[PDB]
PDB file of C-alpha atoms (C1' of nucleotides) in Angstrom:
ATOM      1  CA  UNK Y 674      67.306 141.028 122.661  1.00 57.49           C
ATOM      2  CA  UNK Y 675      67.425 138.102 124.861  1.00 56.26           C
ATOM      3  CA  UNK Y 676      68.867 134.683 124.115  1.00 52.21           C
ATOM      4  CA  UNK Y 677      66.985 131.695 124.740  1.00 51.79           C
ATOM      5  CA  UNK Y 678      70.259 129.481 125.140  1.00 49.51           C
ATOM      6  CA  UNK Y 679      72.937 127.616 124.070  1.00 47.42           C
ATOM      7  CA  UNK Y 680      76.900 128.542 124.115  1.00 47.60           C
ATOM      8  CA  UNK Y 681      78.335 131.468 123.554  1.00 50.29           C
ATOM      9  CA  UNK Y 682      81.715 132.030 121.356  1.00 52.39           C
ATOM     10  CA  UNK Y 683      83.348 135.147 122.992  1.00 51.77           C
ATOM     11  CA  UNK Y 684      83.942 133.290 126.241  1.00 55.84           C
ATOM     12  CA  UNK Y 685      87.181 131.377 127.690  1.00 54.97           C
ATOM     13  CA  UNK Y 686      85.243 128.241 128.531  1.00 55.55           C
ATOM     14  CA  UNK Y 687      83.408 127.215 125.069  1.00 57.24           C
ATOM     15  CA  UNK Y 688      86.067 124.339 124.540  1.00 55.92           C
ATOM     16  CA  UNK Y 689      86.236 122.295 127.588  1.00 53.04           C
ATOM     17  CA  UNK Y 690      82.252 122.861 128.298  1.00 55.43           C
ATOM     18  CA  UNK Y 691      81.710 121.285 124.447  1.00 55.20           C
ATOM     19  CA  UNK Y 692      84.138 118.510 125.239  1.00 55.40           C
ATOM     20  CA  UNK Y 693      82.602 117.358 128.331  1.00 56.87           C
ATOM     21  CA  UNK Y 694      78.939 117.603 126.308  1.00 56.84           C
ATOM     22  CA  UNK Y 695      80.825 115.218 123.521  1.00 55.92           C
ATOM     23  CA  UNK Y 696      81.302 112.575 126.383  1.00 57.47           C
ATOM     24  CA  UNK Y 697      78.303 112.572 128.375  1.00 55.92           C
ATOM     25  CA  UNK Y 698      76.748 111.872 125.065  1.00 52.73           C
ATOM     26  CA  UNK Y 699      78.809 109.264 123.881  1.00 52.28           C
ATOM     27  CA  UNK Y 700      78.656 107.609 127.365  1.00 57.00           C
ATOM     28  CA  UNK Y 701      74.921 108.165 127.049  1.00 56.01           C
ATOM     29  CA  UNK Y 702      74.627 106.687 124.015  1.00 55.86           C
ATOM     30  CA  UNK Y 703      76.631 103.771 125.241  1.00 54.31           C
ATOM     31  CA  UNK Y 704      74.251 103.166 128.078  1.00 55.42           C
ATOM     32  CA  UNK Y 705      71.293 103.253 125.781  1.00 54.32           C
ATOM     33  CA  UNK Y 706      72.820 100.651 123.136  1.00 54.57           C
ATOM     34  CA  UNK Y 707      73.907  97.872 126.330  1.00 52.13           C
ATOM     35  CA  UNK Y 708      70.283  97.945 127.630  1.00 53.55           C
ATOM     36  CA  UNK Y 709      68.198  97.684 124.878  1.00 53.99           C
ATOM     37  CA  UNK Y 710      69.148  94.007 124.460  1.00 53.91           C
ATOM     38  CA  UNK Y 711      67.281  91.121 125.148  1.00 55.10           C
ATOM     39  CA  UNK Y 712      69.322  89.252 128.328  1.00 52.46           C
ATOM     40  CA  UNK Y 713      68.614  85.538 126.771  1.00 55.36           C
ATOM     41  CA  UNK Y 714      70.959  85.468 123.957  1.00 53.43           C
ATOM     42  CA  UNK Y 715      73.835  87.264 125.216  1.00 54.03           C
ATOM     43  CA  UNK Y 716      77.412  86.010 125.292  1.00 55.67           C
ATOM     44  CA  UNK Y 717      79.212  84.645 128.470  1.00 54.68           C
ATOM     45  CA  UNK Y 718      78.034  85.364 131.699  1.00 53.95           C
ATOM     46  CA  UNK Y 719      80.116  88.978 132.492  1.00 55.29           C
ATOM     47  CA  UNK Y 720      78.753  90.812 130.170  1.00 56.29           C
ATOM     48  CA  UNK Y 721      75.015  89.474 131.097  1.00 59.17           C
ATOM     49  CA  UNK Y 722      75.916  90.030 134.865  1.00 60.99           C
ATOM     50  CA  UNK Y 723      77.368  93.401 134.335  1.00 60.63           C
ATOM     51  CA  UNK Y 724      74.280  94.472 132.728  1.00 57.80           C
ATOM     52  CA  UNK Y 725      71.893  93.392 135.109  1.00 56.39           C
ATOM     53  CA  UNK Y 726      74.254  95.323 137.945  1.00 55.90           C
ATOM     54  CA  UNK Y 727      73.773  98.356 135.993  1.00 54.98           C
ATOM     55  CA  UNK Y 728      69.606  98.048 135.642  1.00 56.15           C
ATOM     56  CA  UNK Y 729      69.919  97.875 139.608  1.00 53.28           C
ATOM     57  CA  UNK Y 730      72.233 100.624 140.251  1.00 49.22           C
ATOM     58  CA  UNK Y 731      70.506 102.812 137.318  1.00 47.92           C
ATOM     59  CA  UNK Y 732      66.588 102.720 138.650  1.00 49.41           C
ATOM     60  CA  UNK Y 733      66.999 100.811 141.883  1.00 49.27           C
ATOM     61  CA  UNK Y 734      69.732 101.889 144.261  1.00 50.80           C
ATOM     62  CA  UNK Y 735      69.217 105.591 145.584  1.00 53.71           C
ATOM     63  CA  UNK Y 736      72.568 106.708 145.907  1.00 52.71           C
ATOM     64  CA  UNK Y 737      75.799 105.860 144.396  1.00 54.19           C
ATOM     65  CA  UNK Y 738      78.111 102.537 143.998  1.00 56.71           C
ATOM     66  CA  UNK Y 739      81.376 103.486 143.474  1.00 54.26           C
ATOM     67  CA  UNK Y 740      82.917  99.876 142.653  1.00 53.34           C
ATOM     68  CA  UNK Y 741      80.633  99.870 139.362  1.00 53.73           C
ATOM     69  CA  UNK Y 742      81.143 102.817 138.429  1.00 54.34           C
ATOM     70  CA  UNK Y 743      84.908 101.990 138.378  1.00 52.25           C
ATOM     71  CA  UNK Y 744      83.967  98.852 136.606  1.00 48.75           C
ATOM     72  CA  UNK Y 745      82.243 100.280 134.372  1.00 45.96           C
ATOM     73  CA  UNK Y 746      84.980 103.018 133.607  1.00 45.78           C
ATOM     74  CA  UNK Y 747      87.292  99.912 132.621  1.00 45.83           C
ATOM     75  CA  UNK Y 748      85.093  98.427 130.650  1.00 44.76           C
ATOM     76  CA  UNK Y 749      84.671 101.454 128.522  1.00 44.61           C
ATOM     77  CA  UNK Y 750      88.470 102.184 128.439  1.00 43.72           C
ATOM     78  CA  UNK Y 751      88.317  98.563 126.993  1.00 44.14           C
ATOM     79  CA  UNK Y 752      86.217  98.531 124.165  1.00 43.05           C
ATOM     80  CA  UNK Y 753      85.828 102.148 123.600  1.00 42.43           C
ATOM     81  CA  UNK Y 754      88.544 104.476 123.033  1.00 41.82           C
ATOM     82  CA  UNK Y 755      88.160 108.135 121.972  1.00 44.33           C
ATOM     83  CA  UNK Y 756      90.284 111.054 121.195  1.00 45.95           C
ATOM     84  CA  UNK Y 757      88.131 114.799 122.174  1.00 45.99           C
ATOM     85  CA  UNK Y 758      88.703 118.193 120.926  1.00 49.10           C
ATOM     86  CA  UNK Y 759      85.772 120.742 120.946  1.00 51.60           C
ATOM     87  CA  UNK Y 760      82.607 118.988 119.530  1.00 50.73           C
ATOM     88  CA  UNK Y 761      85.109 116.866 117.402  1.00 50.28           C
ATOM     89  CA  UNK Y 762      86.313 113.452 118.031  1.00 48.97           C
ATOM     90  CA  UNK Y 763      86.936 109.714 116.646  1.00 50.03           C
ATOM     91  CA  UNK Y 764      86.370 106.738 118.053  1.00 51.67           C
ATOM     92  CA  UNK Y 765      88.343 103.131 117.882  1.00 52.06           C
ATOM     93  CA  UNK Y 766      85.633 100.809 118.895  1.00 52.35           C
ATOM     94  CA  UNK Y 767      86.034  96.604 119.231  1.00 51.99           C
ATOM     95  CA  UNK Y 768      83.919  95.711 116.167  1.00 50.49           C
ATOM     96  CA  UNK Y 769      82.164  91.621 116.896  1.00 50.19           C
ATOM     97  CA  UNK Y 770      81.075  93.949 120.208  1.00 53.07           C
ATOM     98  CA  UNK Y 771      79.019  96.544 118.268  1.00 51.88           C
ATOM     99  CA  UNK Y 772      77.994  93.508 115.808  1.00 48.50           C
ATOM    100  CA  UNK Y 773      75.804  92.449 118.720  1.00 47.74           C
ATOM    101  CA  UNK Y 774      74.967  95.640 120.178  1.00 48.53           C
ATOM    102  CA  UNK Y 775      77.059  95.755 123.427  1.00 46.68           C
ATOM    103  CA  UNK Y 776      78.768  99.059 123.022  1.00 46.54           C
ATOM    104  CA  UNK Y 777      77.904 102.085 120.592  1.00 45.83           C
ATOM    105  CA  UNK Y 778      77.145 102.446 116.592  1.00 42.54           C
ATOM    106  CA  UNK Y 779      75.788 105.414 114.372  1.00 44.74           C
ATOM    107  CA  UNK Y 780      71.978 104.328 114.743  1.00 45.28           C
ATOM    108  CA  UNK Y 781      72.085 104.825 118.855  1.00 47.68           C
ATOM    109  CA  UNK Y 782      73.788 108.349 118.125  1.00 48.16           C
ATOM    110  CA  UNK Y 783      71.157 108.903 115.717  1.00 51.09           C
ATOM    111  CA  UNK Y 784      68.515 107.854 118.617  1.00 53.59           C
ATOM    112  CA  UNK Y 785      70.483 110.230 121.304  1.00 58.14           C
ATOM    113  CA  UNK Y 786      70.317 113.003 119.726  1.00 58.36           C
ATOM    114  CA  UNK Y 787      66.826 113.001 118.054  1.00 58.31           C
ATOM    115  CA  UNK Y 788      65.314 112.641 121.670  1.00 54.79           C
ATOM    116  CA  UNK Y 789      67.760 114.679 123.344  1.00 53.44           C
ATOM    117  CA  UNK Y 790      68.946 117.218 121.151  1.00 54.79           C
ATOM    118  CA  UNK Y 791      65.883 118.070 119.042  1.00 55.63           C
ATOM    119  CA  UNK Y 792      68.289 117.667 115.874  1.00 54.91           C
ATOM    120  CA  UNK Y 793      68.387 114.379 113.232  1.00 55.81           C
ATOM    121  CA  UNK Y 794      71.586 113.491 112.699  1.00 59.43           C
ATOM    122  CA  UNK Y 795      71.508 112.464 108.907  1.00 53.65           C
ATOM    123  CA  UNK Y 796      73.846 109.139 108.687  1.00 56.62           C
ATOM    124  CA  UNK Y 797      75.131 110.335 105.824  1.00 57.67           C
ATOM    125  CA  UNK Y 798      77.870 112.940 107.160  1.00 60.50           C
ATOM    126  CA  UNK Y 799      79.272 110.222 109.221  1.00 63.69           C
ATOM    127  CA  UNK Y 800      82.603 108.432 108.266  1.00 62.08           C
ATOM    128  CA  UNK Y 801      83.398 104.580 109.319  1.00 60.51           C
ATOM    129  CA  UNK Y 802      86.533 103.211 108.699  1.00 61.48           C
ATOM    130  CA  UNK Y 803      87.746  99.637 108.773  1.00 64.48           C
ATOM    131  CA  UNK Y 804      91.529  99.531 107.997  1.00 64.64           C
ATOM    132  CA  UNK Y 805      93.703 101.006 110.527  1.00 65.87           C
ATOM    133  CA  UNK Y 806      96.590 101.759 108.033  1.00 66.03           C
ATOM    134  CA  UNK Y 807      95.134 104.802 106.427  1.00 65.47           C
ATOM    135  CA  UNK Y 808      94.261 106.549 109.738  1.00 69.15           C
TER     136      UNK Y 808
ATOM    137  C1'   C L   1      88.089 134.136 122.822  1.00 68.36           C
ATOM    138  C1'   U L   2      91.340 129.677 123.580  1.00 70.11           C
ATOM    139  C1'   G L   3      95.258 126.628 121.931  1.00 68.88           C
ATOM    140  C1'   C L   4      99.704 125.747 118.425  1.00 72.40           C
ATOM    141  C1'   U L   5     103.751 127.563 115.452  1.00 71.72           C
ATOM    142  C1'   C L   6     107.148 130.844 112.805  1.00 73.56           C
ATOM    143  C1'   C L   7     110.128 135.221 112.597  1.00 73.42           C
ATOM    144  C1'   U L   8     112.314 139.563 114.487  1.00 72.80           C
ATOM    145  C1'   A L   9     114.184 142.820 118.077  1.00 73.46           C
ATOM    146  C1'   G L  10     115.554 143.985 122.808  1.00 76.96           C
ATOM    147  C1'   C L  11     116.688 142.825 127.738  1.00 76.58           C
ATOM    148  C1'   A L  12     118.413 140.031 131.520  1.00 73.74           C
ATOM    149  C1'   U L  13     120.539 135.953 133.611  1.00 75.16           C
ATOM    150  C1'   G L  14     123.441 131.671 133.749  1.00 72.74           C
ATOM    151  C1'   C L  15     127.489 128.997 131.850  1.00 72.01           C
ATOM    152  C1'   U L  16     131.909 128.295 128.639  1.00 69.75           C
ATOM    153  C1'   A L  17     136.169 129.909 126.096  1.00 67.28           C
ATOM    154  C1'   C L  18     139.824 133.744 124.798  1.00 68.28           C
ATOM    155  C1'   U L  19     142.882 138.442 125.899  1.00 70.63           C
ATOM    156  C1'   A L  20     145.176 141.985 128.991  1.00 71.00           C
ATOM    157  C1'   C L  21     146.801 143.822 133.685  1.00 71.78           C
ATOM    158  C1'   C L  22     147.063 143.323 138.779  1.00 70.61           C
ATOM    159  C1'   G L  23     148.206 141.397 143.212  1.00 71.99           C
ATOM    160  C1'   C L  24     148.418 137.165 145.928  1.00 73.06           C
ATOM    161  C1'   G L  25     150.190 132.336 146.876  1.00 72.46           C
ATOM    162  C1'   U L  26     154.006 128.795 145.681  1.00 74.86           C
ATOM    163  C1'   A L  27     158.348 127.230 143.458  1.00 71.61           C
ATOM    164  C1'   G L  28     163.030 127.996 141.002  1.00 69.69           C
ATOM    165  C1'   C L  29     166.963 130.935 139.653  1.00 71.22           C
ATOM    166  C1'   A L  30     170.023 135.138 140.400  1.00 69.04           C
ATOM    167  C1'   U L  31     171.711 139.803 142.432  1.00 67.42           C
ATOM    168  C1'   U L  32     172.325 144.139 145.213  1.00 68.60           C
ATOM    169  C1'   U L  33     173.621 146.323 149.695  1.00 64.23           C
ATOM    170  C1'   C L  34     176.384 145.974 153.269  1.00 62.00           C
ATOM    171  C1'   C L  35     175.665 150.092 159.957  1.00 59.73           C
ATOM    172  C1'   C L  36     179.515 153.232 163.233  1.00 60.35           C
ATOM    173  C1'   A L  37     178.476 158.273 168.052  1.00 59.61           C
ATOM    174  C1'   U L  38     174.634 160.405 172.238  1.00 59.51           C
TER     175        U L  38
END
RNA sequence: CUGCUCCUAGCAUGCUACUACCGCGUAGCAUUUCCCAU
């Protein structure tokens, strides 16, 4: 027969390859949520400022700006820590961020992967904890 | 197929300790022999 696609099982590289898919799509989906936010009610200046940088260097600038990109980095390692195995992971997000839609949340996963994996994510196998006792 | 762990066996290496003998080196103690012509 021939296969249309997707990974394999029997190989030696199915692990890393599905860890690196887990964070281009979380980073995507982080990119998505900051820019789909109306610029006049945001919170002080940085965060407006930082987002307007990133429309330019997204759709504007040809080739790349390093200096963002490690600003960027930071910013994520800020507000958005995760911990990756193969297609698994959890997340310790700020929480008055995502209230305003400035980093990630389920609906933008939801969004990602219904236009970019042709799947729909039902909300309802997701898990969201508040307490950080009971891990 | 990758990663983690347990257990077993063997090997090999390194290191430590013990025992024996050896000789060395040092020190102490003590003795045994005592010499001759062309």
């Amino acid at each position: 027969y021939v296969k249309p696609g997707g990974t394999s099982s029997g190989d030696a590289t199915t692990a890393y390859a599905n860890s690196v898919f887990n964070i281009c799509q979380a980073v995507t989906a982080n990119v998505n949520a900051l820019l789909s936010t109306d610029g006049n009610k945001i919170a002080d200046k940085y965060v407006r400022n930082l987002q307007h940088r990133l429309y330019e260097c997204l759709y504007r600038n040809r080739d790349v700006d390093t200096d963002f990109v490690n600003e960027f980095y930071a910013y994520l390692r800020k507000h958005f820590s995760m911990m990756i195995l193969s297609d698994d992971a959890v997340v310790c997000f700020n929480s008055t961020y995502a209230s305003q839609g400035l980093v990630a949340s389920i609906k933008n996963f939801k969004s990602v992967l219904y236009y970019q994996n042709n799947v729909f994510m039902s909300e309802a196998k997701c898990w969201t904890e508040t307490d950080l006792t009971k891990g």
